[PDB]
Amino acid sequence: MKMASTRCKLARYLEDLEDVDLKKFKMHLEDYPPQKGCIPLPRGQTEKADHVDLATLMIDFNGEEKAWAMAVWIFAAINRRDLYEKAKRDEPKWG
Amino acid sequence: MKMASTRCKLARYLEDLEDVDLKKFKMHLEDYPPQKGCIPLPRGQTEKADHVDLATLMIDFNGEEKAWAMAVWIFAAINRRDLYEKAKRDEPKWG
Amino acid sequence: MKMASTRCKLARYLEDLEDVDLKKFKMHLEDYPPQKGCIPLPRGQTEKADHVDLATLMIDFNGEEKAWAMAVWIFAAINRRDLYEKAKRDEPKWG
Amino acid sequence: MKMASTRCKLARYLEDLEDVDLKKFKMHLEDYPPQKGCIPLPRGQTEKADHVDLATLMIDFNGEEKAWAMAVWIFAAINRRDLYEKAKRDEPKWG
Amino acid sequence: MKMASTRCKLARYLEDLEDVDLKKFKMHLEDYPPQKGCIPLPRGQTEKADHVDLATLMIDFNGEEKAWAMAVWIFAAINRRDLYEKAKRDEPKWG
Amino acid sequence: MKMASTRCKLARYLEDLEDVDLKKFKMHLEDYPPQKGCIPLPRGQTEKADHVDLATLMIDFNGEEKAWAMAVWIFAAINRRDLYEKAKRDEPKWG
Amino acid sequence: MKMASTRCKLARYLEDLEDVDLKKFKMHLEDYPPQKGCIPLPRGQTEKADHVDLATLMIDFNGEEKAWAMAVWIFAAINRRDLYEKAKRDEPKWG
Amino acid sequence: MKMASTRCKLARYLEDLEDVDLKKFKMHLEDYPPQKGCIPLPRGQTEKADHVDLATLMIDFNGEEKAWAMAVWIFAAINRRDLYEKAKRDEPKWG
Amino acid sequence: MKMASTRCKLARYLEDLEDVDLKKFKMHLEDYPPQKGCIPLPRGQTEKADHVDLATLMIDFNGEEKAWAMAVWIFAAINRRDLYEKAKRDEPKWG
Amino acid sequence: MKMASTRCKLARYLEDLEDVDLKKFKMHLEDYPPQKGCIPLPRGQTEKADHVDLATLMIDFNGEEKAWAMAVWIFAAINRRDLYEKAKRDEPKWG
Amino acid sequence: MKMASTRCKLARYLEDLEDVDLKKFKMHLEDYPPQKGCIPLPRGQTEKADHVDLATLMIDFNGEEKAWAMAVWIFAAINRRDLYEKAKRDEPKWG
Amino acid sequence: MKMASTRCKLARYLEDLEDVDLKKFKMHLEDYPPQKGCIPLPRGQTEKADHVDLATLMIDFNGEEKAWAMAVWIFAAINRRDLYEKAKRDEPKWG
Amino acid sequence: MKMASTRCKLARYLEDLEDVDLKKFKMHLEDYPPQKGCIPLPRGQTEKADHVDLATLMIDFNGEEKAWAMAVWIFAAINRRDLYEKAKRDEPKWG
Amino acid sequence: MKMASTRCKLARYLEDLEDVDLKKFKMHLEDYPPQKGCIPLPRGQTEKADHVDLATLMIDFNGEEKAWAMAVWIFAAINRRDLYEKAKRDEPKWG
Amino acid sequence: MKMASTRCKLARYLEDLEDVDLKKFKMHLEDYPPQKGCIPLPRGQTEKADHVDLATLMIDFNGEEKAWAMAVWIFAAINRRDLYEKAKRDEPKWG
Amino acid sequence: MKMASTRCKLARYLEDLEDVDLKKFKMHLEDYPPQKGCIPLPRGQTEKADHVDLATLMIDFNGEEKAWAMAVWIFAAINRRDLYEKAKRDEPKWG
Amino acid sequence: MKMASTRCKLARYLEDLEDVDLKKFKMHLEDYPPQKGCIPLPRGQTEKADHVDLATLMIDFNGEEKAWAMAVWIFAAINRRDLYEKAKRDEPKWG
Amino acid sequence: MKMASTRCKLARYLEDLEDVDLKKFKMHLEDYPPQKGCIPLPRGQTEKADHVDLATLMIDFNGEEKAWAMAVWIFAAINRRDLYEKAKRDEPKWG
Amino acid sequence: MKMASTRCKLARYLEDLEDVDLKKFKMHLEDYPPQKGCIPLPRGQTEKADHVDLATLMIDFNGEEKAWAMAVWIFAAINRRDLYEKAKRDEPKWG
Amino acid sequence: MKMASTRCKLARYLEDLEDVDLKKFKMHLEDYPPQKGCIPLPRGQTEKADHVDLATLMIDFNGEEKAWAMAVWIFAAINRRDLYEKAKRDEPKWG
Amino acid sequence: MKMASTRCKLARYLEDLEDVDLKKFKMHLEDYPPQKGCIPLPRGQTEKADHVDLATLMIDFNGEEKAWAMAVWIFAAINRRDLYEKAKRDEPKWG
C-alpha cells in the first residue's frame, strides 16, 4: 500500500505497460546504450518475464538507482510520456 | 440465476456493453478520476479482458461496494443511460 | 462408453462448454452461493483446469451429489439451457 | 474443517491466489519493509514454494501473529481486496 | 520390433495418445467400473506416469489380459476410435 | 499427393469450404442427428478447429466410414452440392 | 488382498492421494488440533515418508483407532470428500 | 542357475521388486495376518535387508512351505500380478 | 553454415513452413502411407515439436534417407511446391 | 516358544524395535526417572548391546517385574503405541 | 530517444509502415534476391512478427549493415519513397 | 512421556527439526559464540548424529542449563520461531 | 564324517548358527524351562564357548537324550525353523 | 579414447540416449523376449542405474556378445535408428 | 566481471540465446561435423543443461580453444550474427 | 540472531541466491581467478552442497577474510548487485 | 603373481565380486545342491569371511577340484557371466 | 600444500571429479587395457572408495609411473579434457 | 548398594563412561599434570583394564583423596559435565 | 581442561576433523615428506585409530615438537585453514 | 634406529601392511610355491602373530636370505608394489 520497496513500484509501472509496449521495453532493455554505466540485460531471461520478473531482473542487474534511471529513460523512449512524467514525479527518496 | 454474487451481476452488465462501448468502459477504468477514493486499473491487465476478467479485476481491485459505484458512474459516463438506471434499480442488498 | 463413472459424464459435459462459457463456469464456481451447503472452489486451481481437472476438482471438493447439483444450477445460470435440460434428463441413478 | 491450526488457514488463503498474484505475493514477501517487526523471507526458498511451503515458511520465520499481519498487509498491497477483507473478517482469536 | 512383450505394445499405444487424451485415459483408469473384474489404479501414481510408467502400472496391477481389455475399453470410451480399432485388429495371441 | 489417407482427403475437402460455410459445417457437426449411428462432436473442441483439427476430430470420433458419411451428408445439407458429388465420386476404396 | 492389517489399508488410502494433497496431509498431521487426545507427528520424520512410512508413522504414534480417526478427519479437511466417504464406509470392525 | 535352492529363487523374486514395492513387501511381512499359520517378521531385522537377507530371514522364520505361500500372497496383495502369476506357475515340487 | 548435418538442413526446411502448413505436415507425418517402408510417427510427441524437435523425431524414427524422402514427398503433398523443388535440388550427397 | 522365560519375551520385544527406536530406548534406559524405585542403566553397557544383552542387563539390574514395567513405560514414551499395547495385553502372570 | 541502437530506430521505421505495406515488406523479406550477400528470412517466423520481432529477426539474421541495406532497398521497392530517403538521411554512423 | 529426562525433551525438539534445518542447527552448534560461557561442539562428532546423539552430545558437553539455553538461542537463530516459543513455554523447572 | 558320536553332530549344528543366533541360543539355554526335566546352564561357563565347548557342556550336563531335546527345542524357539526340521529328521538312533 | 573395453563403448551408447528413451530402453531390457537365448534384467536393479551401471549390468548378466546384440536390437526397437546403425557399424571384432 | 575464466564468458554468451535458439544450439552441438578436430556432445546430457551446464559440458569435452571455436561457428550457423560478431570481437587471449 | 559466526552470515547470503544463481555461484567458485591469492574449490564437493555445505567449504578452504572477499566478488560477478551491496555494507569488523 | 596356489587365485576371484554379489555367493555356498557330491558350508563361518577366509574355508571343506567347480558354477549362478568365462578359461592344469 | 607425495596430488585430481564422472573413472579403472603393462583394479575394492581410498588403491596396485599414466589416460578417455591437460602439464619429476 | 567403599563408587563412575570416553579418560590419566601432587599411571598397566582394575590402579597409586580429585578433574576435562556434576555433588565423606 | 598435556590438545584438534578429512590426514601422515627430519607413520596402525590413538602414535613416533609441526603443516595441506590458524595461534610454549 | 638387525627391518615392513593385506600376506605364506627352495609356514603358529612374531617365525624357518626373498615376492604378489620397490631398493648388504 503506497510505500513499499523499489521493486514493487517498478513492477507496478511495468504492469501499467501494454503487451506491445512491454515488447518494446524489453527490446530497449536488451540494447541499452553502453554509456551512462549500465549493464544491458541478456535476452535469455527477458523472454518470459511478464512484469514482475522483469522488474526483479532490472533491479538485480543494475541496482535501484540505475534501474529507476533506465526505466525512466525507456519510458521516455517508447513514447509513453505519461508513465515517464509519473516516474519523474514519483522518484523514491534515495538515501 | 437471479440471486448470485456481485461479480456475476457485474459480468452480465458488462455483457450488455457493445464493442466500442466496451473500449470506452476500459478507457474510463484505466483513467478513473483520482478522487472518490479509487485505485485506477492498470492498462496491462485491462487490455485482453473482454467482459468476465474485466469484472473480476474491478471487483478484486476496488471491493464490491466501490466497484458497483464505479460501474454505475461509468455506465452514466458512456451515455448508456438504460444500463445506468438498470444498475441503480438492481443494486444488490448490501450487508 | 455410456455406463461410466460420474466424473466421466461431468467431464464430458464440461467439455461441451465453449471457452468463454468455460470462463463463466469457473467464475460461477469460484463464487457459489454460501447456502445449499456447498464449498466454493478456490481460484488457485480453477485457472489452469480446462475440462478434465475442473471436473476432478469439483467432484473432489463437493462429493458426487453436490457436484452434479452445482453443475446443473450453473448450467442454468450461465444461460446454457440445452446443457441444463440434458443434465436434468440424464441425472445419474444415485444409490 | 473450520477450526484448525493457523498454517492451515494461511495455506488456504495462499491457495486462493492466482499464479501472477502468487508471484507478486512472493515479491512482496522478499522485500517486506524493515519496520513493523518482520523478517523478510530469503529469495532462495521462496521459488519452489507454491502455497503450502510458502505458508509454512512464513509461519516458521515470523510466528503466527506476524505471519497473519504480513498476509493481511500483502493481500492489501497486491490489490487482492476480497482476500484482504476475508482475512480481516476471519482473523483468528489469539491466545 | 513387431514381436515383443505386451508392455511394449501397450506403451506404444499409450504414447500415440495426445496430452488431453492422456489425461482422459488416466481419469478413466482411476475410475474404471468395479465390475468386469478389474482393479482401478490409485490416483497417486497416475500423475507422473506419462506413457511407459502408465503402461507398466496397468500391466502390473491387472495382468496382461485385463490390461489389454481395459486399454481397448478406454480407447473406445475417450472416443479414440482409430486407436480402438487398431488395438482390436492387433489383439495379441494369448497363451 | 493423390493416394493418401482418408484424413488427408477430408482435410482437403474442408479446405474447399468457405468461412460461413465452415461455420454451418461446424453447426451441423455439433448437432448431428441422433440416428445413422453417429456421435455428435462437442461444442468446446469444434470452436477453434478450422480445417485440419476439425478433420482429425471427426475421424477420431467417428471412424473413417462414419466420418466420410457425415461429411457427405453435411456437404449436401449446407447447399454446397459441388462438394457433395465431388466427395461421392472420390470415395476411398474401403477395405 | 481385501483382508489385511490396518497399516495396509491406511497405506493404500494415502497412496491414493496426489502430491500436493500429500503435502497438505503432512501439514495436517504436523499441526493436528491439540484436542481429541492426539499426538501430532514431528516434522522431522514427515519429510521423506512418501506413503508407507507415513502410514506406519501414524499408526505407531497414535494406535490404530486414533490413526484411522485422524486419517478420516484430515481427508475431510484437505477437501478429499471421495476418500473421506470411502474411509467412512470401509472402517474396520474394531474390537 | 535354474535348478537351485528355494532361497535362491526367493531371492531372485525379491530382487525383481522395486524400491517402494520392497517397502510394501516388508510392510506386509511385518503385519502378516495371524491366521494361515505364519509368524510375522520383526520390524527390527526387516529394515536393512534388501533382497538377500530378507529372503533368508523369511525362510528362516517360516520354512519353505510357509515362506513360499507368504511370498505368493504378498505379491498378490501389493499388486505385483505378474510376479504373483510367475510365482504360482513356478512353485517348486515339495517333498 | 551451408555444409552441416542432415538434421540441420531438415530443421531449416521445416522452419521455412508456416503454422498451418506445419499442422498439415504433422498430419501427413502421422498418416504416412504404409508402403515405401516408413514408420508413421506417434501423435504423442508430434504435438509440441515446432520445427527442431520435429526434424529430430523424423530422423530418429526413419533414418536420414527415409526422413529426407518423407520430407520431400510431404512437401509435394502439402502443396508447397517451392520447398519441394528446393529439397529436390539440394539433396545431400549420400555415401 | 510361547511359554518361556521373561528374558526371552523381553528380547523379542526389543528386537521388534528399529535402529533409531533402539537408540531412543537406550537413551530412556540410561535416564530413567529417579521415582518409581528403579535403577538407571549405566551408559557403558548400553552401547554395544543390540537386543539380547540389553534385555539381560535390564533383568539383572532391576528384576523381572521392574524390567517389564520399565519396558512398557519406555515403549509408551518412545511413541511405540502398538508395542505398548502388545506388552500391556501379554503381561506375564507374576507370582 | 534519438541516440539509441540500430534495432530501435529500425523498429520505429517499421512502425511507420502500414498494414498491407507491412505485408509487402514481409513478402520481400522472405524472397530477398540471392545477390547482394544477404540471407532471406524464413516464412515460418515472419508471419507472427509484426514490427518488433520482424526488426530483431532482420538484425539477428543479417547484421546491422546488411539489415539497414535491405531495409532501405525494400522501402524503395514498396513505393514508400518517404521512408526511403528518410532512411538515407538517418543512416547510423557505422564504426 | 511428558515427564521425563531433559535429554528426552531436547531429543524431541531436535527431532522436530527438518534435514536442512538440522544442518543449520549443527552449523550453529560448531560455531557457538565464545562468550556467555559455552563450549562449541567439535565438528567430528556433529556429523553423523541425527537427533538423539546430537542431543546427548549437547547435554554431555555443556551441562543441562547451557544446553537448554543454546537450544533456545539456536532455534531463534535458524528462524524456527515456533520451536523457540515452545522452548520458552516448556522450559524445565531448574533446581 | 557322517557316522560319529552325537557330540560331533551337535557341534556341527551349533556351528551352523550365526553370531546373534548363537547369542539367542545361549540366552534360551540359561533359561530352559524348569519342567521337562532339565538343568539350566550357569552363565559363567556358557559365556566364551563358541560352538564346541557349548556342545560338550550340554552333553555333560544333560545326557544325549536331553541335550538333543534342548537342541531341537531352542532351535524352534530362536526361529531357526530350517535347523529345527533338519534336527528332527536326523535324530540319532538311540540305543 | 577410441580403443577401450566393451563396457565403455556400451556406456557411451547408453549415455547417448535421452531420458524417456532411457526409460524405454530399461523397459525393453526388463521384458526382453524369451527367445534368442537371453536373460532379462530384473526390475530391481534397472531402477536407479542411469547409464554406466545399466551397461555394466547388461554385460555382467549376459556376456559381451549378448549384451551388444541386445543393445543393437533394443536401439532398433525403441526407434533409435541413428544409434542402431552406429552400433551396427562399430561392432567390436569378436574372437 | 570482465576478466574471468573461459567458462564464465561462454556461459554468458549461451545465456544470451533464446529458447528456440538454445534448442538449435544444442542440435548443432550434438551433430558437430567430424572434421575441424571436435568431439560432438552426446544427446543424453544436452537435454537438462540450460546455459551453465551446457557451457561447462562444452569446455570439459573439448578444451577452451575448441569450445570457443565451436561456440563461434554454431553462433554463425544458427543465424545469431550479433552473438557471432560479439564473440569474434571478444576472442580471449590464449596462452 | 544478528551477532553470530562468519559462516552463519555467509550461509544466509548464499541462501538469498536462487537456484540458477546458486549454480552460477558454484561455477565461479570452481574457476576463481588464479590471482588475488585464492584456492579454487574442487568440483567434487561443490556438486551436492546446497547453501550451508558450500559456505562451510568456502570458509574451510580460504579462511574467513578470503571467503568474504570471494563471496563479495562473485556476488558482483553473477550480477547480484543487491547482494553485493549488502555484503559490502555488512562486512564484519576484522581484527 | 600369476603362478601361485589355488587359494590365491580363488581369493582374487572372490575379491573381484562386489558386496551384494558376495552375499549371493555366500547364499549359494550355504545351500549348494546335494547332488554333484559336494559339502555345503556352514552359515556360521560364512558370515564374517570377506574374500580370503571364504576361499580358505572353501578349500578346506571341498578340496581344490570341488572348490573350483563350485566357484565356477556359482559364478554362473549369481549372474557373473564375465567372471564365469574368466574362471572357465583359466582353469588350473590339474594333475 | 603443493609439494607433497604423489598420492596427495592424485587424490586431489580424483577429488576434482564429480559423482558420475567418478563412476566412469572407476569403470575405466576396472577394465584398463591388458597391454602397456598395467594391472586392472578389482571391482570389489573400487566400489566404496570415493577419492582417497581409490587413489591409494591405484598407487598401491600400479606404482607411481603406471598410476599417473593411467590417471592421465582415463582423464582423457572420460572426456575430462581440462583435467587431462592439468595432469599432463603437472607431471611430477620422476627419479 | 549405596553405602560401600569408595572403590566401588569409582568403579561405577568409570563404568558409566562410554568406550571412546574411557579411552580419553585413560589418555588423560597417563598425562596428569605434574603439579597438584599426583603420580601419573604407566601405560603398561592401564592398557587392558576396562573399569574395575583401572579404579583399583588409580586408588593404589594415589590414595582415595587424590583418586577422587583426579576422577572429577578428568571427568571435567574430557567434557563429561554431567558426570562431573554428579561426582562433585556425591563426594564421599572423608574422615 | 585448557592447561593439559600436548597429547590432549592434539587429540582435540584431530577430533575437530571430519571423517574424509581424517582420511586425508592419515594419507598425509603416511607419506610425510622425507625432508624436515620427520618419520612417516606406518599404514598398519593408522588404519583403526580414529582420533586418540592417532595422536598417541604421532607423539610416540615424533616427539612433541615434530608432532605439532606435522599437525600444523597437514592442517594447512588438507585445506583446513581455520584449524591451521587455530593451531598457529595456540601453539604451546616450548621450553 | 636405521642400522639394526634384519629381523627388525622385516618386522617394520610387515607392520607397514594393513589388516586385510596382512591376512593376504599370511595366506600367501602358507602356500609358498614348493620351488625356489623354501619351507611354507604351518597354519598353527602363523594365525595370531601380527607382525613381530610372524617375522621371527619367517626368519627361524627360512634363514635371512630366503625370508627376505619371500617377503619381496609376496609383496609383489599381494599387489603391494610400493613396498615391493622399497624392499628391492633397500635389500640388506649380505655378508
Side-chain angles (χ1 to χ4, degrees), chain A residues 56-76:
Chain A
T56 70
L57 208 68
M58 293 177 70
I59 297 281
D60 190 359
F61 266 80
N62 295 124
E64 296 189 22
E65 305 311 319
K66 304 282 211 43
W68 198 264
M70 311 155 38
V72 165
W73 186 87
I74 297 169
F75 287 154

Side-chain angles (χ1 to χ4, degrees), chain K residues 54-68:
Chain K
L54 190 56
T56 187
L57 207 70
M58 185 180 288
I59 295 282
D60 180 17
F61 267 85
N62 296 127
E64 297 188 24
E65 301 315 345
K66 297 293 186 290
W68 198 262

